């Protein structure tokens, strides 16, 4: 749960942050955000998530919601290949390294 | 019009901590308050309980208390004054007239002849203005007078 | 239930209103709920500050 | 001043403002703006409260000192912020005649949680005011402090302008913002005029209403524009072929 | 009802388990009675003020012949221990006895100082089915 | 369809098999629930109950 | 807070005039009122639902 | 409806045992009742751990500044009269006012069951390992 | 329901039976309709 | 003092430990000496009180 | 010794919360600060008008008493010692139409009837 | 009742039923017309007997109209004869104010707390007296930190009594 | 973070599957945008999330398009590739939204529910004053008092 | 509203719940915040301005547009006539004073004088 105290709290952090010329804990967040953001690739044809077989057990029976929690519990996100995330990928919407961002800006000067 | 939470919600299937669910005597509903509710752990229902607890009527009317508690206290630290007794000649002419008791006659308009439209009940007065009426014995004013802005002068607001 | 009083503002102000409280408070902020609101302004293509609107409940009041 | 090891650093504190404020009271010839904001907290009482007297007169047992202090709890007259060493070296400064070194630019919050005579329990899951002052107590800038007030308005219709093209587009720019997804949201005139209308003009709702524009369910007019560019797209391609 | 316990058992329907309105149920049976709790000794199932006079039934009303039981809500006085003499409560199957005598019952009512219901559990009072099912319950042995 | 893209197919069965295994469990048909004969007179037509083995 | 409830007798003052405790007190014989001494004066709450 | 079975007679010397049983029960909760009364005030008079939760402000905060220095020159003595039970902890500082509103808002203390253990305790099994065999609601060591 | 099988989906009265067709979509954009007009007619003379 | 308010100010002088017999040990109470033989008292009654 | 223990000993006239014992110097803090923290203070206590000041009000109470006022602080109030609805609730004149569920009318008058 | 209850046995009992029920006699009057000239010349309610009426009955008032409503007796007469006495007795103890000014109720004002203006000069009261004190505490102050490492105001100012 | 409690974990599908009424009230996903945009981050996954759904809701009253007899069954196939494609984009969300918050929560000392793992501080689901005394999936026994991640000063 | 043309308070004595006046220009006219109306902001005037001054053509309040393509309606006579000002409406108001007038108003039924000269 993610309260707008919370928010408030983020947002102190976030200028004290700015203020002391820390660039640290930024770079360690974009790097997060590059990482898992990549846009998911399309599924091809003939694709899709398995239900639970009918004819099993009553339709009120536990053993649906059983089935649903393991095979979610068998695919966790670094299972997820659907989605692009390596060093191989090329991310054209965002920006490489540290080098990049606009607190490097004397670097970029000629 | 408080966005708050007035309403003790009903006893169901056992509410558990999930996205989007929190047990129903959870700390977080109420201030903390629901302490005074809950019965912890797998309650066995033939020996164990207090009635009371799981009942409708009565939890919902704990709630409508601390509700009440909490505006009471609310309309209370809202008051910056005292109510003063002060004797009918020494008042300020907009208080000479006969005022009805609360909720008695339409709720009055302090001086609709001078301008002032506005409830007489709610109107507040300046303890620098009454000092005169209020502290008699002391001679040399022990609030020192107000000081006001003069709204015709040039000041910064005026582009002066 | 609700009822609308509707007047036209030929100084180009307009506010809407509910139970005499601003909208903006009434609703609580909430842009996705004002904006069901707006929307009559946008379907008759109107501008919605040539307009003063004062909203009444007549159900049952909550607050 | 701030350089100690705990706990030492909270009385090096103390004598330290006070010397402070007596050296900016003693300098005549140099300019000195003091900022504060919210100076409306400064004007009335602390939320603190004077120690109950029993803390100062030490004790035996609990069972008869006549005390009630672990018993039931009880309200104690605030601490006015007049009386904080601080604000009393600014005041001193104020009130004394012959300092017109100093000028006090300040400001007022009225940043506190809303009451409307009824009020609930808060949602802590979902609450905008957790972190508001509780004041609920009116206040004037004329009658209670010795400033000179001016008045402040939400955006007019330019600066509004202004403002809201400069958070939208700058911040597309920047790509904090919809970015390859620009034909979801609408364009920059509705936006305007719709986020004028939520906000009412008032800064702090501007940013907001900027920010939830995310949700907004009910606007059709990259829809409807869409739809005309196809069709328009066909005609072409039946002119064509 | 199912097996007659009393006469009403000829009139009374269970209708299933059955939901009453708060602190409303026909059959007043304190099952909670003796319910121990040291720190709340005074406060529980006990008068809602220590300020209150004893009730009706610790007092002799009228000229009696005399009585056999005394009902249950007498609270037990100094007198109940010193004096000696029979002292009798209605509870099932028949009667129970103060017959030694204590301090420590003084100013609870006997409605406290009598258990309600039972450990001790007689197979003759029950049919062979119900014998079975309170064996199922892991109460008697077997 | 909203939220159109360019975006390129990913390899077939992305998906690692789950931790239920269908494989072992027997489909049941005709005695799964109960149901009640509408059957006014007579013997029930024995070819759909029991005529074959 | 925690005061002593106070009244000032009309003799008293710098103009004589009527205390409304006094009133209180002329209403309490007219319509016969028990007054209850033990009553908490931080007690008082509207009843929020109803009112 | 079915007519009522007869329920069965009752049995024989089973008044005497029943009197037997009920009356020894009474017995035996003599020395219940004592030995929970010794184990309350017990509990009562002896120390216990801080009832605060290290884990929020005004607390997590080093114990040399701070609140703590608010309650080691200021409080000490009170804080030690009472035991450390957390409803006279709460109230008195309540009434030390130099916190003053955010005893309750701001501030965070450890929920009943776990601010009851006794002082210089190390593990949480501490809750189930106090003695089952006396009345006190839990509010025994 | 009891002991037996839950129904088809349709099997069931419509779920928005109560809801009138001119809501299930909302066709707004009614401003928008004149102004895609004067522009094709435009368009179409250019 | 019920757990309540005042919890915290019950003292161990409260305790009739000469009524009782206690394990060593355990610290626990084992049995309880008789209460009514030897029990003498001015004031069976109330001390106002003359039958 | 019935005040050494102060929540056992209640009379059926008693009423929460209870107030707290006085304290001399403490209605304002002009009079603190003199006769506490610092005690060559010129002013014993701050102006103190003539006329009678009401700090309950609307409600009226009984001169001479001593009293408190509604808690700003909710903290005072959460940690005060009053209690919760237990029992059975009881209303003076609707104890006789019983419940919610029963509700007892002697005579079919309309709801809105008004006695003239 | 004209229906059922009309004619027989219980038609006694039912009626009687109805004339208990009914024993509330509203009475009212106008406070306009209890402002006249009363027959020794004298204005019978003027403007303060009316604030001390208004007080003295709080909610038996509204719109400008005193209502008293007597429920205390089973029959129509006798409540009618309540009502009249407990009218002039509240008449009677109203008219004091026409004895003098000393039974004019007072007006209840709301007088706010002293503003901030004047709240400001809280900083400087005894002045003089603190700043020269002030020294002196930090002469003992300067003396303390010598000792110790923290220095306590209940080292230097405050004073906590031992025992 | 207020609640402290053990807790009943979903899976994401089912999460999403509740639409309008959380995973995407509008509410919700505006706070998560505020975190993102205050962290200097874009939300692009957030921004697919609320088209998607948006659209979702937009015609929720509506009855699917004409089912056409196929044999080949291409639009069966289709529509439910264009199906699965959208829960992964929603996937991709629901599983941002949870690490960005536990690393922000890292930031501001704050303390999770329990057995929740936050990333450079607790390896191990943190645990502290749970109803049983062990460490639920660790088997191992808990300290009183409660676990302290972070270094006191505030 | 026609009510509370006319209405005057020292009528309202002797009725009951007629007496009072119509709630919400009531409870408006008492809110000074209300007192002090916006004039028609910079951008609002300005516009007007250049539109009837530079391009020759006065902007249209929405009741003079003529939005039937097929007749010509005569202008209603309220058109641009009716006057803003919060004192009037919209209705606004403070709560404390919706709170006293409701409960009031409930109190109050029962005062009447039937019998008036």
């Not at chain 5, 000794?41 to 039934?57: G, R, V, Y």
Request: hydrophobic share 35%; charged share 25%.
């Amino acid at each position: 749960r993610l309260t707008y105290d919370h928010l408030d709290q983020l947002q102190q952090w976030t200028m004290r942050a700015t203020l002391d010329g820390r660039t640290e804990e930024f770079n360690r967040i974009r790097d997060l955000h590059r990482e898992w953001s990549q846009h998911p690739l399309m599924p091809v044809l003939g694709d899709v998530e398995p239900k639970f077989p009918l004819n099993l057990f009553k339709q009120n029976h536990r053993a649906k919601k059983r089935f649903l929690v393991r095979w979610h519990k068998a695919n966790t996100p670094a299972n997820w290949l659907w989605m692009p995330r390596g060093p191989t990928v090329v991310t054209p919407l965002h920006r490489t390294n540290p080098t990049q961002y606009p607190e490097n800006w004397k670097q970029m000067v000629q | 019009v408080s966005t708050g939470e007035f309403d003790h919600p009903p006893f169901q299937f056992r509410q558990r901590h999930t996205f989007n669910t929190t047990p129903l005597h959870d700390a977080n509903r109420f201030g903390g308050r629901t302490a005074y509710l809950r019965e912890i752990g797998p309650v066995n229902i033939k020996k164990q309980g207090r009635r009371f607890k799981k009942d409708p009527r009565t939890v919902q009317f704990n709630v409508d208390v601390w509700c009440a508690q909490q505006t009471l206290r609310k309309r209370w630290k809202q008051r910056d004054w005292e109510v003063i007794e002060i004797p009918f000649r020494l008042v300020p002419r907009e208080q000479q007239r006969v005022i009805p008791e609360l909720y008695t006659d339409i709720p009055q308009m302090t001086d609709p002849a001078r301008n002032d439209f506005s409830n007489i009940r709610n109107k507040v007065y300046d303890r620098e203005e009454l000092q005169g009426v209020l502290f008699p014995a002391a001679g040399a004013m022990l609030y020192p007078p107000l000081q006001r802005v003069d709204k015709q002068a040039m000041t910064l607001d005026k582009y002066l | 239930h609700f009822t609308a009083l509707l007047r036209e503002n030929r100084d180009h102000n307009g506010i809407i209103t509910v139970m005499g409280k601003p909208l903006s408070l009434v609703l609580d902020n909430k842009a996705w709920l004002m904006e069901m609101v707006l929307m009559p302004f946008d379907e008759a293509n109107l501008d919605y500050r040539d307009f003063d609107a004062h909203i009444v409940s007549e159900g049952h009041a909550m607050p | 001043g701030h350089r100690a090891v705990a706990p030492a650093s909270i009385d090096r504190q103390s004598v330290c403002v006070k010397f402070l404020m007596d050296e900016l009271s003693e300098e005549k010839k140099l300019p000195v703006v003091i900022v504060v904001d919210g100076w409306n907290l400064f004007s009335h009482e602390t939320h603190f409260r004077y120690p109950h007297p029993d803390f100062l007169r030490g004790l035996a047992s609990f069972n008869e000192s006549s005390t009630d202090i672990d018993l039931y709890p009880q309200e104690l007259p605030r601490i006015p912020a007049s009386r904080l060493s601080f604000v009393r070296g600014l005041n001193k400064m104020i009130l004394s005649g012959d300092d017109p070194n100093k000028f006090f630019i300040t400001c007022t919050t009225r940043d506190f949680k809303p009451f409307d005579g009824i009020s609930g329990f808060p949602n802590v899951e979902t609450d905008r005011f957790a972190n508001s002052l509780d004041e609920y107590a009116p206040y004037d800038p004329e009658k209670d402090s010795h400033f000179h007030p001016i008045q402040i308005g939400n955006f007019d219709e330019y600066e509004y302008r202004s403002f809201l093209r400069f958070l939208i587009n700058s911040g597309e720019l920047a790509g904090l913002g919809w970015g390859p997804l620009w034909h979801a949201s609408s364009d920059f005139e509705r936006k305007l005029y719709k986020i004028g209308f939520l906000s009412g003009r008032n800064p702090q709702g501007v940013v907001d209403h900027y920010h939830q524009e995310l949700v907004w369910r009910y606007d059709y007019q990259r829809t409807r524009q869409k739809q005309y560019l196809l069709k328009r797209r066909m005609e072409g391609m039946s002119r064509g072929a | 009802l199912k097996i007659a316990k009393s006469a009403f058992g000829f009139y009374l329907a269970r209708r299933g388990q059955r939901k009453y309105p708060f602190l409303r149920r026909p059959h007043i049976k304190n099952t909670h009675s003796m319910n121990p709790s040291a720190p709340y000794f005074w406060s529980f199932m006990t008068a809602k003020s220590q300020m209150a006079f004893l009730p009706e039934e610790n007092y002799i009303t009228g000229d009696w012949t005399g009585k056999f039981f005394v009902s249950k809500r007498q609270v037990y006085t100094l007198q109940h221990a010193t004096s000696g003499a029979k002292v009798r409560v209605k509870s099932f199957p028949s009667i129970f006895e103060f017959n030694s005598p204590s301090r420590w019952n003084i100013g609870k009512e006997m409605n406290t100082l009598t258990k309600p219901r039972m450990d001790l559990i007689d197979e003759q009072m029950l049919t062979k089915k119900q014998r079975l099912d309170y064996v199922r319950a892991g109460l008697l042995p077997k | 369809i909203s939220y159109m893209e360019d975006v390129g197919r990913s390899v077939k069965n992305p998906t690692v098999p789950g931790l239920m295994s269908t494989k072992g469990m027997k489909k049941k048909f005709h005695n799964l629930y109960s149901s009640t004969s509408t059957k006014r007179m007579g013997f029930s037509n024995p070819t759909l109950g029991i005529k074959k083995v | 807070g925690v005061h002593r409830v106070g009244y000032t007798h009309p003799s008293t003052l710098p103009v004589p005039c009527a205390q409304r405790w006094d009133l209180r007190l002329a209403r309490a014989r007219i319509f016969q009122e028990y007054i209850e001494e033990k009553a908490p004066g931080a007690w008082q709450l509207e009843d929020e639902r109803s009112m | 409806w079915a007519k009522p079975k007869k329920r069965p007679k009752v049995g024989q010397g089973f008044h005497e045992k029943a009197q037997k049983w009920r009356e020894e029960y009474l017995l035996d909760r003599h020395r219940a009742l004592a030995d929970s009364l010794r184990a309350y005030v017990e509990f009562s008079t002896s120390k216990r751990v801080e009832p605060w939760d290290a884990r929020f402000k005004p607390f997590d905060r080093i114990e040399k500044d701070g609140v703590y220095v608010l309650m080691r020159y200021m409080m000490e003595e009170k804080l030690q009269l009472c035991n450390y039970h957390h409803r006279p902890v709460k109230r008195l500082f309540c009434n030390i006012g130099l916190m003053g509103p955010q005893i309750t808002t701001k501030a965070r203390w450890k929920p009943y069951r776990f601010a009851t253990n006794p002082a210089g305790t190390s593990k949480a099994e501490r809750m189930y390992q106090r003695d089952k065999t006396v009345y006190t609601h839990g509010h025994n060591d | 329901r009891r002991g037996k099988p839950r129904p088809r989906a349709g099997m069931f009265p419509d779920k928005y039976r109560r809801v009138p067709m001119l809501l299930k979509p909302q066709q707004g954009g009614q401003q928008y309709f004149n102004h895609f007009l004067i522009r094709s007619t435009n368009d179409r003379l250019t | 003092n019920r757990p309540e308010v005042a919890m915290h100010r019950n003292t161990v002088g409260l305790l009739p430990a000469h009524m009782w017999e206690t394990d060593k040990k355990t610290g626990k109470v084992k049995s309880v000496k008789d209460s009514v033989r030897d029990y003498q008292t001015k004031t069976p009654y109330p001390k106002w009180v003359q039958l | 010794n019935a005040e050494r223990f102060p929540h056992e000993y209640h009379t059926p006239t008693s009423r929460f919360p209870p107030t707290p014992s006085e304290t001399p110097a403490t209605q304002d803090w002009m009079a603190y600060t003199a006769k506490y923290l610092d005690k060559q203070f010129t002013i014993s206590a701050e102006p103190a008008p003539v006329y009678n000041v009401n700090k309950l009000w609307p409600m009226q109470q009984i001169p001479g008493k001593v009293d408190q006022t509604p808690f700003e602080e909710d903290q005072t109030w959460l940690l005060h010692s009053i209690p919760v609805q237990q029992l059975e609730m009881h209303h003076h004149e609707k104890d006789l139409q019983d419940l919610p569920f029963i509700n007892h009318e002697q005579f079919p008058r309309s709801l809105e009837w008004n006695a003239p | 009742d004209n229906l059922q209850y009309k004619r027989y046995d219980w038609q006694g009992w039912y009626q009687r039923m109805l004339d208990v029920h009914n024993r509330n006699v509203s009475l009212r009057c106008r406070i306009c017309d209890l402002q006249r000239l009363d027959g020794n010349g004298v204005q019978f309610v003027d403007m303060q007997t009316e604030r001390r009426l208004r007080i003295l009955a709080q909610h038996r008032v509204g719109m400008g109209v005193l209502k008293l409503d007597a429920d205390k007796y089973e029959d129509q007469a006798d409540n009618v004869t309540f009502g009249t006495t407990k009218l002039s007795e509240l008449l009677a103890d109203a008219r004091k104010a026409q004895l003098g000014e000393e039974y004019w109720p007072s007006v209840e004002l709301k007088v706010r707390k002293p503003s901030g203006q004047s709240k400001a000069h809280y900083s400087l009261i005894d002045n003089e007296r603190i700043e020269k004190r002030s020294r002196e505490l930090y002469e003992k102050y300067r003396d303390a930190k010598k000792r110790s490492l923290f220095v306590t105001p209940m080292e230097t100012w405050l004073e906590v009594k031992g025992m | 973070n207020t609640f402290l409690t053990s807790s009943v974990a979903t899976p994401p599908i089912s999460v999403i599957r509740t639409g309008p009424k959380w995973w995407a009230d509008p509410e919700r996903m505006v706070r998560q945008k505020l975190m993102y945009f205050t962290l200097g981050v874009d939300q692009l996954p957030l921004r697919r999330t609320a088209v998607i759904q948006r659209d979702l809701q937009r015609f929720h009253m509506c009855k699917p398009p004409p089912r056409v007899g196929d044999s080949t069954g291409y639009k069966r196939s289709r529509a439910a590739q264009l199906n699965t494609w959208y829960r992964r984009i929603q996937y991709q969300e629901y599983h941002m939204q949870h690490l960005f918050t536990r690393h922000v929560w890292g930031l501001l000392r704050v303390y999770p529910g329990n057995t929740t793992k936050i990333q450079g501080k607790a390896d191990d689901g943190y645990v502290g004053y749970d109803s049983v005394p062990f460490h639920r999936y660790n088997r191992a026994p808990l300290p009183f008092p409660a676990r302290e991640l972070y270094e006191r000063r505030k | 509203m026609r009510e509370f043309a006319r209405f005057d308070p020292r009528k309202s004595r002797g009725n009951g719940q007629k007496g009072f006046p119509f709630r919400d220009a009531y409870l408006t006219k008492m809110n000074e915040a209300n007192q002090k109306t916006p004039p028609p902001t910079l951008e609002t005037i300005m516009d007007r301005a250049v539109r009837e001054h530079h391009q020759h053509a006065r902007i249209l309040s929405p009741l003079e547009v003529q939005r039937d393509v097929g007749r010509l309606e005569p202008i209603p006579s309220y058109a641009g006539k009716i006057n803003a000002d919060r004192s009037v409406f919209p209705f606004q108001w403070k709560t404390e004073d919706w709170y006293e007038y409701e409960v009031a108003k409930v109190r109050n039924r029962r005062f009447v004088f039937e019998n008036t000269e």
